[PDB]
Structure formats: structure tokens, C-alpha cells
Design an enzyme around this catalytic site. Structure first.
Site, PDB file in Angstrom:
ATOM      1  N   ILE A   1       0.818  -1.200   0.000  1.00 52.75           N
ATOM      2  CA  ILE A   1       0.000   0.000   0.000  1.00 52.75           C
ATOM      3  C   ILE A   1       0.852   1.250   0.000  1.00 52.75           C
ATOM      4  O   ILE A   1       1.739   1.412   0.837  1.00 52.75           O
ATOM      5  CB  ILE A   1      -0.933   0.033   1.225  1.00 52.75           C
ATOM      6  CG1 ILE A   1      -1.832  -1.205   1.236  1.00 52.75           C
ATOM      7  CG2 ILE A   1      -1.761   1.304   1.233  1.00 52.75           C
ATOM      8  CD1 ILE A   1      -2.605  -1.391   2.533  1.00 52.75           C
ATOM      9  N   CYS A   2       0.581   2.132  -0.949  1.00 58.74           N
ATOM     10  CA  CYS A   2       1.224   3.430  -0.977  1.00 58.74           C
ATOM     11  C   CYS A   2       0.365   4.436  -0.217  1.00 58.74           C
ATOM     12  O   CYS A   2      -0.610   4.965  -0.752  1.00 58.74           O
ATOM     13  CB  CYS A   2       1.452   3.887  -2.415  1.00 58.74           C
ATOM     14  SG  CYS A   2       2.407   5.413  -2.546  1.00 58.74           S
TER      15      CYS A   2
END
Ligand SMILES: [Zn+2]
Ligand SMILES: [Zn+2]
Ligand SMILES: [Zn+2]
Ligand SMILES: [Zn+2]
Lengths: 142, 148, 138, 139
Positions: free
Chosen positions: B84-85
Site C-alpha cells: 500500500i502506498c
């Protein structure tokens, strides 16, 4: 024959009186025990009260004005004062009132202000209203 | 055992569940959580359920929690391995944030994708140039991977 | 504090990409869309002054559900004659390779590959005649 | 006749004794009520004590009552240990993210916490002592 009857009745009455006296003695003993328990309870209560009146009065009260800190500021030496109080002091002296170390820093303390508001909130409306008055009075000063 | 805070949050999750998010402790690791996030309403993920895993490192809360999707998802800020960014998972992490803030933020990322992110996928490019097609593909992948 | 399988493997993924030491072993995901992070490609450069020298060995490393509490499964793809490696299948016999036989959860794919490369230098391996270069098992 | 008079006197004495017993019972009941009131009062100060406890004095990083409270320039406070660990990674307040310019020990916070915690259970007091020791070992 009603003679010995009367005597027998008197003896029975005496026995009843003795029983009543014994019951009274037992009741007195119970009362004494209750009193002792009450005293113990009072002693248990007392420690918290002392702790509260050295909480509120010894840790929370500004040494300059004797009020619960208003806009608490903490100095480099770890002592705290009302913002108003310490500023007036600092116009005349740059030494901590309490330890007399040269003052090198001030910081406000949200935690101390919030703690004090919560504590004062549990006190009489006289104490609460006095605090409100000083806050605004020292705000007018600002 | 665990620091009070971890105990605090762990039991807050069981007692006060985040809406649209399930979070259960692992059966062997008290710092390991299995999360299910419902696709947000009015999103192309709506109707889907997405597995996430969350781990609280030793240095938590000084260090950020570790989070990853375990369900394949078409999203500019989730890569092929589910990483996840999200800047509060790296840059803007502070010990005041807590676990459920992260989880709600992840849910919000689903609700409002950030294609314009520097370290974004390649899915991002499709999302930028052909947003309509990307949204349908997101819905397609939801059908394919997140309905069971 | 135990790091869960999936997050440990993410760590190993990043380490693989960064590379370690002199690059004589390397590892990466076999399938770049494998979210289970289960199947890995291993690479060992055959060590100098052995019959393995100047050869690149490819391996398959499988990290199961209990990894790294449990050792991974390893097999050579590149054909190799080496004690502990099944001559016909390339499968690495865990009992014959100390890092696997005495597995600890502190170990990693890196450690397994470095151990196999070290064992290639052993007296009983370094002199083994090798199959022709380029051959692989099925 | 004399016997009858004696019997009457005895009856009167018995009645007086009964009245005294009733009075004693009433006194006992009053004492019991007072004891109950005292118990109720004892119950309340504990709530007034758990007020600052949970809500005001806890470090946001560790969720424990502050251990060696320090106050930043931005007016936020943390345990000395917790902020010192935080600052190995970021020189900014965990709460407001302002740059940290000063860190000041707070005697008032520490004394208030120490004094209040001293009234709570052995379990609570002991946890704090352990945490201080653990943090000390860390130091
Ligand atoms: Zn003052
Ligand atoms: Zn001072
Ligand atoms: Zn703390
Ligand atoms: Zn701050």
C-alpha cells in the site's frame, strides 16, 4: 397455695429480667463493634482527603499568587508558575522564584492546564467562579 | 506481555469495531491481525470484501504498523503484491495516529484513489488517461477476486 | 515478537532486490504477481577452484505456510552433482544440508543459498564431475 | 399483698429494660446508616481519583501515566523515554508535528502522578514501578 404461686411467678419474672439484661449487654457490645468499624472507615477515608488537600494545595497552587495555576508555564528548572505571575516576576528578577536558578526557558503546558480544569471542576462553584474571574482578569491584562 | 497501548487498541478493535472493517487477532501472534475491509459505498469496490494483514512491529508505536492487501485489487496505490502506498504508513507516521486511523485511511483510499502519486503503480497511468475504463476494470477485479 | 510469514517474505523481497555481499547468490519472486510470496527463484554462482566454477545455478525455493518457522523446500533447476542433491530430480534433501536439517527461524532464503554455495566448496563436492553446462531437470 | 407489690415492681423494671433495649436498637440502626454513608463516601473519592488517572496524565505514545514527564516548546507532554525514542527518528512533536525546540522536565506533573497513583491498587502501583525499572534498564 396462691402464696407459692405468687412466688413462682416472681421467680419467672426475675429470670425474664435477667435474660433482658443479657440481651441488652449483647446489644451494647454490638454497638461498640459498630463504632469501631466506623472509626476504621473514617481512618481509611482520611488518607485520600489528605492526599487531595496536598494535591490541590501543594502541587497545583502557584507560589506567587496562591491560586491554582492559570496558564501554567514550566521553566528550565522544572518548576511551574502562572504565566501572568512569572512574567511580572521576570520584569524584576531572572531567577526562578523557588530554586533561584537563572531562568533560561519557559514553556506553556496544555496537560497541566487540562488537569487543573478537570480537578477544579469537582470543587465548589465559588472556587470555580473565582478561577473564571482571574482567567478573564488576566486576559484583560494581556 | 504487550505494552498497555497495544492491549488497549487490540481490545478496542474487538469491542468497538470500525464500520465496514473487521479486524481479528491471529491465533499465534498477538501483534498480527487479519483484517477484512468492505468495499466503500459508491466505489467500484462496493460489494467486495478485501483481506488485509496488519502487523505491529517491536518498536510500535515509534515505528508504523505494517499493512498489506492479501486480496488482489485494481487500485493506483496498491501494487501487484498488495503493498500500500499511503504516506501515513511511512512519511507522515506519528505515535498519535493509532491502528484504526490507518484502517479508515486505507478504506478512504479505496473510496478516493490517488493516481497522481509519484510511486504509483502503472494502473495509475490508466486511471489518469482513461479513468472510466480503470473504474470498470476495478469493478471487474472486484467481481473476480473480492466476492468470495 | 515474531514477524508473520508474509511480512518476513516482504523483507526478503526487498533484500533480494537490494542484493547482498558480492552478488554470488541472489533471489527473487518467481511470479511477480504471486501475492502469497511462495515460489522464489534462487541463483548461485559456482565458487572458484571447484568443478562448479564459472557456472550459474538456478534454483526453485518454496516458502510454505509455516515459513520461516519451518525451512523452505529447495530444488536445483540447473543440473548439479552435489551431495544432498538428488541426482535425477535436483531436489535438495533437507536432512543432508545442515542449514535445512538444523533450520532456525532466523534463517532466510539468502542463508540457504549461501550455505549451498559454501557446501559446493567442500572436499567431497568440489571434485565431483559435473554434467554438461546448461542442462536442467524436468 | 407484699408479694403482689413486689411482682408489680418487677414488671415495671422489665418494662423499663425493654424500653432501654428498644433505644439501643434504634442507636444501632443509626450507626449502621452512618457506616453505610461512610462507605458510599469512600467509594466516590476513588472515582475522583480515577478521573485524572486515565484521562489527563497518560502519555499518548505508551498509554501509561507519564513517567518523567517532559513538556515540549509546543506545550505538549510525553514520557522522557518515549519522546527520547521518538526523536531518534523525527525531531517533531508526535501530536502537533511542530519542530521540537525545547524539552523541559515537569516536577508538578511527576509529583501529581506519584501522589495520586500511591492511592490506587497494589497492581497499579507495581506496574508503574516495573515500567520505571524497565525504562531504566533501557537507559
Ligand atoms: Zn500565579
Ligand atoms: Zn526553579
Ligand atoms: Zn510514554
Ligand atoms: Zn506538540
Amino acid at each position: 397455695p396462691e402464696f407459692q404461686e405468687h412466688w413462682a411467678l416472681m421467680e419467672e419474672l426475675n429470670r425474664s429480667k435477667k435474660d433482658f439484661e443479657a440481651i441488652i449487654q449483647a446489644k451494647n457490645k454490638e454497638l461498640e463493634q459498630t463504632k469501631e468499624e466506623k472509626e476504621k472507615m473514617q481512618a481509611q477515608k482520611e488518607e485520600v482527603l489528605s492526599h487531595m488537600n496536598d494535591v490541590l494545595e501543594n502541587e497545583l497552587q502557584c507560589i506567587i499568587c496562591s491560586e491554582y495555576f492559570i496558564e501554567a508555564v514550566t521553566l528550565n528548572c522544572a518548576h511551574s508558575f502562572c504565566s501572568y505571575c512569572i512574567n511580572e516576576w521576570m520584569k524584576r528578577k531572572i531567577e526562578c522564584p523557588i530554586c533561584r536558578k537563572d531562568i533560561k526557558s519557559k514553556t506553556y503546558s496544555l496537560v497541566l492546564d487540562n488537569c487543573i480544569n478537570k480537578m477544579v471542576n469537582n470543587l465548589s462553584s465559588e472556587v470555580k467562579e473565582r478561577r473564571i474571574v482571574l482567567i478573564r482578569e488576566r486576559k484583560a491584562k494581556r | 506481555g504487550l505494552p498497555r497501548r497495544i492491549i488497549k487498541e487490540t481490545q478496542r478493535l474487538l469491542a468497538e469495531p470500525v464500520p465496514g472493517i473487521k479486524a481479528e487477532p491471529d491465533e499465534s501472534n498477538a501483534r498480527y491481525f487479519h483484517v477484512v475491509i468492505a468495499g466503500p459505498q459508491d466505489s467500484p469496490f462496493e460489494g467486495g470484501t478485501f483481506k488485509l494483514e496488519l502487523f505491529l512491529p517491536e518498536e510500535y508505536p515509534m515505528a508504523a504498523p505494517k499493512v498489506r492487501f492479501m486480496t488482489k485489487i485494481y487500485h493506483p496505490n496498491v501494487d501487484k503484491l498488495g503493498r500500500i502506498c499511503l504516506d501515513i504508513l511511512k512519511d507522515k507516521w506519528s505515535p498519535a495516529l493509532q491502528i484504526r486511523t490507518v484502517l479508515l485511511s486505507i478504506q478512504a483510499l479505496l473510496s478516493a484513489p490517488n493516481p497522481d502519486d509519484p510511486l504509483a503503480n502503472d494502473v495509475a497511468e490508466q486511471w489518469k488517461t482513461n479513468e472510466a475504463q480503470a473504474i470498470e476494470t476495478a469493478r471487474a477485479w472486484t467481481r473476480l477476486y473480492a466476492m468470495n | 515478537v515474531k514477524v508473520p510469514r508474509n511480512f518476513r517474505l516482504l523483507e526478503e523481497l526487498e533484500e533480494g532486490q537490494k542484493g547482498v555481499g558480492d552478488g554470488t547468490v541472489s533471489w527473487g519472486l518467481e511470479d511477480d504477481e504471486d501475492m502469497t510470496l511462495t515460489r522464489w527463484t534462487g541463483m548461485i554462482i559456482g565458487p572458484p577452484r571447484t568443478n562448479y566454477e564459472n557456472r550459474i545455478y538456478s534454483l526453485k525455493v518454496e516458502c510454505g505456510p509455516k515459513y520461516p518457522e519451518a525451512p523452505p523446500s529447495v530444488r536445483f533447476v540447473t543440473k548439479i552433482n552435489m551431495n544432498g542433491i538428488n541426482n535425477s530430480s535436483g531436489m535438495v534433501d533437507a536432512r543432508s544440508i545442515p542449514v535445512l536439517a538444523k533450520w532456525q527461524n532466523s534463517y532466510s532464503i539468502k542463508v540457504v543459498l549461501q550455505e549451498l554455495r559454501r557446501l559446493m566448496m567442500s572436499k567431497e563436492n568440489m571434485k565431483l564431475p559435473q554434467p554438461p553446462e546448461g542442462q536442467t531437470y524436468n
